[PDB]
Symmetry: C2
Subunit: 101 residues, 2 copies
């Protein structure tokens, strides 16, 4: 009920030793009333996090634009950043590298 839904998890595997920090996207949840359950029919484990570790982030889904040179033989890491249409204000850049076919 109240629809608990996990949209995604950054990783899909990790050391069985645990302790690996991850993050998951999901629908609305009560930070003062929510936990992450790792489990099997016979075992159960809980992800470790505080209320502060629960954020209300915005997310954008989009397809990457093709690169100017499709014949690059070397990886080319360019910049990616948010830009406001109205004033052309940008955010700090983040990297993303293009690979050759």
């Amino acid at each position: 009920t109240s629809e608990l839904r996990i949209c995604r998890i950054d990783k899909e595997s990790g050391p069985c030793t645990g302790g690996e920090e991850l993050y998951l996207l999901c629908d609305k949840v009560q930070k003062e009333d929510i936990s992450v359950r790792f489990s099997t029919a016979s075992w159960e484990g809980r992800g470790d996090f505080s209320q502060a570790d629960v954020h209300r982030q915005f997310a954008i889904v989009f397809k990457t634009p093709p690169y100017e040179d499709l014949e690059i033989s070397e990886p080319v890491t360019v910049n990616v950043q948010l830009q406001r249409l109205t004033d052309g204000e940008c955010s700090e850049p983040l990297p993303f590298t293009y690979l050759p076919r």
Copy 2:
């Protein structure tokens, strides 16, 4: 200004041919006033997405609990899901596999 900030991008590389669907987490943005800029000092490209492709997701950061058996020799993909403390209501499970040291 108005602090445009990209928190993360699911991938950090992809084909130079583009067209690869990705997603980025970021602070508040005006879906009717925002764009993604791919660039270099001499080139500029724009991520393709509609207003609908802009979501207001919640995200949880946490460390994975260690697995019951640290001596597993085979990968063990268990279940991960949200669980409400109060009523123990769970969300659909999503997989995550543990690997051996």
